[PDB]
Design a protein around this ligand. Structure first.
Ligand SMILES: CC(C)CCC[C@@H](C)[C@H]1CC[C@H]2[C@@H]3CC=C4C[C@@H](OC(=O)CCC(=O)O)CC[C@]4(C)[C@H]3CC[C@]12C
Ligand SMILES: CC(C)CCC[C@@H](C)[C@H]1CC[C@H]2[C@@H]3CC=C4C[C@@H](OC(=O)CCC(=O)O)CC[C@]4(C)[C@H]3CC[C@]12C
Ligand SMILES: CC(C)CCC[C@@H](C)[C@H]1CC[C@H]2[C@@H]3CC=C4C[C@@H](OC(=O)CCC(=O)O)CC[C@]4(C)[C@H]3CC[C@]12C
Ligand SMILES: CC(C)CCC[C@@H](C)[C@H]1CC[C@H]2[C@@H]3CC=C4C[C@@H](OC(=O)CCC(=O)O)CC[C@]4(C)[C@H]3CC[C@]12C
Ligand SMILES: CC(C)CCC[C@@H](C)[C@H]1CC[C@H]2[C@@H]3CC=C4C[C@@H](OC(=O)CCC(=O)O)CC[C@]4(C)[C@H]3CC[C@]12C
Ligand SMILES: CC(C)CCC[C@@H](C)[C@H]1CC[C@H]2[C@@H]3CC=C4C[C@@H](OC(=O)CCC(=O)O)CC[C@]4(C)[C@H]3CC[C@]12C
Ligand SMILES: [K+]
Ligand SMILES: [K+]
Ligand SMILES: [K+]
Ligand SMILES: [K+]
Ligand SMILES: [K+]
Lengths: 242, 242
C-alpha cells in the first residue's frame, strides 16, 4: 500500500544519505587523522625515550590520567554537579563528563531517565506550543500596527533560532574564552541533544562552585534553546508524523 | 486556562524531580568521588616522585594521552568508522569517541545533522507504527488460536523491550567480554539516545576492520532497538502529545 512504499522510500533515502555522509567524512578526515596519529606517536616516542619510562608503567599512567580527567575540573558530584548531571540525563544530551561508578547509582540513573524522559518531552512540547501561539499573536499585532501564512511563521522561527544560536555563541565565547565558530558549534550540538562531549561548559577553574550566576544563565539558556527547538520541530516536523 | 495550569504543573513536577535526583546523586556519589580523587592523587604523586617527571612535561604527557586516546582503538575514520560516526550523528546518540578536527568538517556535520534528523525521526515513527500493527495482528491470531485491550498491548510492548534488552546485553557480554549488568546498562544507554560514551562498542583490537559480521550485527541490533523504542513511545507517550 501507500504506507509500505513510503517507508521503503524513507529507508532507501536514509541508507543513501548515510553512505554519502560516510564517504564525505572519510575523504575529509582520513589524511588529518593519519597526520595526527603520526605526530602523536612521534611525540610519545620522543618523551618515552627521553624519560626512559617503563612500558608496564606507561599503561598505569594512561589509566590514571584517563580516570583523573574529570577530577581536574573540580568536584563534579556536588549540588551543582548533580543538578547538571540530572539535567543532561533528562534531556538525553549525554555529555559524558561525569558518570556513575556504582551499580546502584547506575540503576537509579536508568530508572530516573525512564521516569523523566516522557515528562520532559511533554513539558517541552507544551512550552513550544505556547511559544508558537505567543509568536503568532505578536506577529498579528505587529502586522496590525504596520491573516498570517505558514511561510511567515517558518521564517520567523528560523530567524529566532539563528538569533538564539548567535546570542549563545557570543555569550559562550565571552565567558569560556572560546572561538566564535567553536562556540556556535558547541551551542548547536547542545541544542540538538547530541552531546559529543568535546566541548563542555562549567568545567574551567571550578566555575560550578564559584560562579552561581553563570550556572544559572547556562541553565536558562539551555532551557530556552530546547524550548525553541521543540517549537520549531512542532511547527515543521510534527506535521509529518500523524 | 487549562493549558496554563497543566504546563505550570509540568514545570513544577520537573523542577521537584530534578531537585530530588540531584540530592540522591550527590548523597550516593560524593564519598566515592572523594575516595577516587584521593587514590588517584596518591598514585600520581608516587609515580611523579619515582620518575622525577618535570611539572611542565606532565601537562604535555596529559595532552598527548588525551588526544591519542581514540587512535589507540585503530583507524576511526575509515569506511566503517565514518559509517558509525554518521549513524551516531543521525540518531542523536553522541558517543564522542571520534570528533571532527576541521572547521569545514564541523560545518558539514552540522548540516548533515540538520538535514538528517527529521528524516530519521519520520522513518522510525513509520517503522514503529508498522511494527505495532504487525504485533496487533499477531496477538489477534494467537488469541484466535487459543478484541484486544490497550493494557495487553502495553504489556506486550514492555515484554518485547525487556527481551530485546536482555538479548543485546547477553550478546555484548559474550562479544566484548563485559559484565551482564554493564552490558545491560550500555544497551539501555544506547537505546535511549543518551550516549554517555563510557562504554563504546567496536573499539577493541580493531574490530571495525577485522569483524564485518560483528559490525553488521551491532548496526542491526541498534536499528531494531531504536525501532522498538519508537514503537513503545508511540504506543504510550505520543497519545499525550496532541
Ligand atoms: C534582547 C536580546 C537581543 C538580548 C538579550 C540580552 C543578553 C545580551 C543578556 C541577557 C542575559 C545575559 C547574561 C546573564 C548572565 C551572565 C553571567 C555573567 O557572569 C558573571 O558576571 C561572572 C563571570 C565573570 O566574571 O565574567 C557574565 C555575563 C552573562 C553571560 C550575561 C551576558 C549577556 C546576556 C546574555
Ligand atoms: C520560572 C522559571 C524561570 C524559574 C527558574 C528557576 C531558576 C531561577 C533556578 C532553577 C535552578 C537554579 C540553580 C540550581 C543550582 C544552583 C547551584 C547553587 O550552588 C550552590 O548552592 C553552591 C555554590 C554557592 O555557594 O553559591 C547556586 C544556585 C544555582 C545556580 C541555582 C540558581 C537558580 C536556578 C537557575
Ligand atoms: C514507561 C514510561 C514511558 C512511562 C512514562 C510515564 C508517563 C505516561 C507520565 C509521566 C509524567 C506524566 C505527566 C505528568 C503531569 C501531567 C500534568 C497533568 O495536568 C493536570 O493534572 C492539570 C490539567 C488537567 O486538568 O488535565 C496532565 C497529565 C500529565 C501531562 C502527565 C501525563 C502522563 C505522564 C507523561
Ligand atoms: C529545517 C529542517 C527541519 C528541514 C527538515 C526536512 C523535512 C521537512 C523533510 C526531510 C525528509 C523528508 C521526508 C523524506 C521522504 C518522504 C517520503 C515521501 O513519500 C513518498 O514520496 C511516497 C508516498 C506518497 O506518494 O506520498 C513523503 C514525504 C517524506 C515523508 C518527506 C517529508 C519531508 C521531510 C521530513
Ligand atoms: C528468537 C530469539 C529469542 C533469538 C534471536 C537469535 C539470537 C540468539 C542471534 C541472532 C543474531 C545473532 C548474532 C549475529 C552475529 C554475531 C557475530 C558473531 O561474531 C563472529 O562470528 C566474530 C567474532 C567471534 O569470533 O566471536 C558472534 C555471534 C553474534 C553476536 C550472534 C549471536 C546470537 C544472535 C544474537
Ligand atoms: C532490509 C535491511 C535489513 C537492509 C540492511 C542492510 C545491511 C545488510 C547493510 C547496511 C550497512 C552495512 C554495513 C556497512 C559497513 C560495513 C563495513 C564494511 O567494512 C569494510 O568494507 C572494511 C572491512 C573489510 O574488508 O571487510 C564491511 C561491511 C559492513 C559491516 C556492512 C555490512 C552490511 C550492512 C549491515
Ligand atoms: K551524547
Ligand atoms: K558523549
Ligand atoms: K566522552
Ligand atoms: K538525544
Ligand atoms: K544524546
Amino acid at each position: 500500500k501507500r504506507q509500505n512504499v513510503r517507508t521503503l522510500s524513507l529507508i532507501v533515502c536514509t541508507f543513501t544519505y548515510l553512505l554519502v555522509g560516510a564517504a564525505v567524512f572519510d575523504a575529509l578526515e582520513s589524511d588529518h587523522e593519519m597526520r595526527e596519529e603520526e605526530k602523536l606517536k612521534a611525540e610519545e616516542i620522543r618523551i618515552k625515550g627521553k624519560y626512559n619510562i617503563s612500558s608496564e608503567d606507561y599503561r598505569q599512567l594512561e589509566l590514571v590520567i584517563l580516570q583523573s580527567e574529570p577530577h581536574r575540573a573540580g568536584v563534579q558530584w556536588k549540588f551543582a554537579g548533580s543538578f547538571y548531571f540530572a539535567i543532561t540525563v533528562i534531556t538525553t544530551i549525554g555529555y559524558g563528563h561525569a558518570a556513575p561508578g556504582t551499580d546502584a547509582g547506575k540503576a537509579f540513573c536508568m530508572f530516573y531517565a525512564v521516569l523523566g524522559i516522557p515528562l520532559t518531552l511533554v513539558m517541552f512540547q507544551s512550552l513550544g506550543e505556547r511559544m508558537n501561539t505567543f509568536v503568532r499573536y505578536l506577529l498579528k499585532r505587529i502586522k496590525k500596527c504596520c491573516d498570517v501564512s505558514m511561510e511567515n511563521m517558518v521564517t520567523v522561527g528560523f530567524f529566532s533560532c539563528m538569533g538564539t544560536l548567535c546570542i549563545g555563541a557570543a555569550a559562550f565565547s565571552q565567558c569560556e574564552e572560546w572561538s566564535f565558530f567553536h562556540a556556535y558549534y558547541y551551542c548547536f550540538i547542545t541544542l540538538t541533544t547530541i552531546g559529543f562531549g568535546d566541548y563542555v561548559a562549567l568545567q574551567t577553574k571550578g566555575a560550578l562552585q564559584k560562579k552561581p550566576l553563570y550556572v544559572a544563565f547556562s541553565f536558562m539558556y539551555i532551557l530556552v534553546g530546547l524550548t525553541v527547538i521543540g517549537a520549531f520541530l512542532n511547527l515543521v516536523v510534527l506535521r509529518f508524523l500523524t
